[PDB]
Design a protein around this ligand. Structure first.
Ligand SMILES: O=C(O)c1ccncc1
Ligand SMILES: O=C(O)c1ccncc1
Lengths: 130, 130
């Protein structure tokens, strides 16, 4: 019955939008193990851009989140079918291409993002008042 | 066996320092129910000062934290012995006076703060780079 879900991301400056996404992946099936992958500082910088928190800070915050069962930190930047076999992952859960092969296989579970809740935007709140 | 712990605070812009505190209160005894009280916007402003997130935003974030079993939102600003009886609270868990009466009664459990991890300070990080 237990379904293994893998959700990777930068998880920089974790906010409610991030945690609703993790809650969503956790609840994709009735009995799950949610594995979260945290990307490395170097690869995030090289491919995405500026990260505020280090790998260790981003990883420690996630350990406090109710929905997170296991953590791979750091995690590979690109998911491969080897990786899926290595960790016995049944579905990859991410927002939406690079995930075509997963959707083709029956193993992609779309999860949704929440905007405006970002730590970035809460400073703007502090500031559109100054 | 189950021990009811009450930890109140503003929980504005929840960071790792906040979550380590909640983890600490949760683990005060082997079997606990951790109740978290979230203070109102008006009373925080009036007694503490400027709050960034609303009551509802601060409360929703806490629902995602592994250690939080129950939430009182909003919560009273001052704990009273009536309140303790009302919720069957065995210990109040807070950092450290206003908690003398609790310590006198055997019902105060000190928890520790973590500095420098504050959302405030992570902007300074972004900025001591500009
Ligand atoms: O959070 C992302 O967009 C991401 C996920 C997996 N690998 C790299 C980046
Ligand atoms: O977080 C605090 O300092 C607080 C705790 C309980 N009542 C008011 C304020």
């Amino acid at each position: 019955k237990n379904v293994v879900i893998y959700a990777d991301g930068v998880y920089d400056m974790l906010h409610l939008g991030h945690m609703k996404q993790l809650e969503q992946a956790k609840k994709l099936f009735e009995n799950t193990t949610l594995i979260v992958g945290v990307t490395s500082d170097n690869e995030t910088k090289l491919f995405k851009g500026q990260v505020v928190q280090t790998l260790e800070e981003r990883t420690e915050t996630l350990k406090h989140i109710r929905w997170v069962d296991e953590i791979i930190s750091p995690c590979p930047w690109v998911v491969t079918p080897e990786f899926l076999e290595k960790y016995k992952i049944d579905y990859v859960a991410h927002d939406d291409d690079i995930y075509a092969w997963l959707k083709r296989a029956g193993k992609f579970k779309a999860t949704q993002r929440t905007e405006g809740v970002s730590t970035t935007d809460l400073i703007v709140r502090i500031l559109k008042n100054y």
